[PDB]
Amino acid sequence: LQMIDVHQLKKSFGSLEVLKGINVHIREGEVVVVIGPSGSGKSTFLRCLNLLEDFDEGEIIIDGINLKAKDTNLNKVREEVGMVFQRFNLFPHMTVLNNITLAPMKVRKWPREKAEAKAMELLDKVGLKDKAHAYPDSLSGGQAQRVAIARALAMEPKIMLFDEPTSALDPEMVGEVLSVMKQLANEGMTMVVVTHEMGFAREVGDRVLFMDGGYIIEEGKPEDLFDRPQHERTKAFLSKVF
Amino acid sequence: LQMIDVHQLKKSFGSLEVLKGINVHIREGEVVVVIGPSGSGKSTFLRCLNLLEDFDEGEIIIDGINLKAKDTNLNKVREEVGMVFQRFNLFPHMTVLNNITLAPMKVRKWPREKAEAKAMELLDKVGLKDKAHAYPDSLSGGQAQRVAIARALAMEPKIMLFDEPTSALDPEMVGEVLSVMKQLANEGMTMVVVTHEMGFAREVGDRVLFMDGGYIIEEGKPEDLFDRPQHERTKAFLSKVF
Ligand SMILES: Nc1ncnc2c1ncn2[C@@H]1O[C@H](COP(=O)(O)OP(=O)(O)NP(=O)(O)O)[C@@H](O)[C@H]1O
């Protein structure tokens, strides 16, 4: 019933315990925003959610399937969780269209015509249908990140992870990437977004999770955490950024 | 006697002819710079060399292998031709190190220990040994492009293709990238470089090809084509990049 469930998740990289046991339970259709200083383990957490990194202690069950359960097919899981990174979301050697159908064809064995019918719909939905036969290098940062999203949505995931999707964009390119995301939030997509775009969080986020030094130090509805933070660390952090 | 041999090379997309027949003969250890306005067919040309695109008429023989030859094995030409793009040169879900070892292991079938060796070297060779375990999102454009080179070098290519490797970099970061390319040239690497960074060409380019609308309008040593261009078009292009 809970789309994403994490119990005392712990993760260490050598002599450094990056995650020190965190608890996260995200309901289906819930949009969760994660914030916090560099090195607080935000990326590591996301990488564990879509089986890109392995964890030490605690357990992660997404959509009711324990990632450590002996039977569970780790690929069905990966297939249902999509991810958009800060950069490097596309293959520069193929067209926008081909970037999008690559996985649906290889992983889902969809015939080309089917994959493309689906790819063009998505592309048309982020306003870049006319970029189908272009290469990534010809796209602005704003168009590329939209293509990146369309590409992840092509696998029709149940979950969508975003690791600083607009962070590396020129300020004017931010808006277009954020509106596509809010629409995703509007259609009930379960979402976890690592971002420091306040506006997006206030208007679309259900909860904000403040991470600092391996722990989720505070959480709450966006309004409450931003305007009336209860923990001294949240305050210090907030005052230093945005 | 010939690393790259291209004859009457013609490429068309639908009813539009992008490469109207070009002839290029590059010898091992040579460095050719390609310049020209948007749509000249520069990228299409590089892609034809790296088996990333197929072609209509004419012929192409890499390191003595005719790509249209029924016999000859293409995918061994692929391993021999490296290529750095303007952007998206890295996998975001992987560590730098892993970005570099991936292909060697997967393609050449190298053992992990071996691959990771070749990787750490190329890394230190580009000034990024301390970042072998970091993720791409943490690299600056310049660092990212350098890792990109290491990643293509790991495969031990006989040829290196560059498509505007510094075009999307802030001015401060172009320098560090051109440098790695300069070294590669001095080490006798057959190179084809699409770049509007005129200095680099004059500094290590044996020849410069000015491309305009499907044809190679003019060419010659850097100093010549740049200081005294014979064609009105070359003269006109250079003026806008003055
Ligand atoms: N192989 C590794 N993978 C991920 N993290 C690592 C690794 N090795 C060391 N670390 C450390 O793990 C800690 C947390 O990393 P991370 O999850 O990327 O923090 P972060 O919040 O995403 N940083 P930023 O992305 O700058 O906010 C950092 O100190 C990393 O240096």
Ligand SMILES: Nc1ncnc2c1ncn2[C@@H]1O[C@H](COP(=O)(O)OP(=O)(O)NP(=O)(O)O)[C@@H](O)[C@H]1O
């Ligand atoms: N499917 C396709 N793949 C690649 N190119 C295509 C395709 N369809 C049409 N084209 C056209 O191929 C022509 C040449 O492109 P290209 O080789 O990238 O020129 P260019 O010099 O690299 N452009 P720029 O990189 O802006 O200088 C362009 O007009 C493209 O629109």
Ligand SMILES: [Mg+2]
């Ligand atoms: Mg991060």
Ligand SMILES: [Mg+2]
């Ligand atoms: Mg190009």
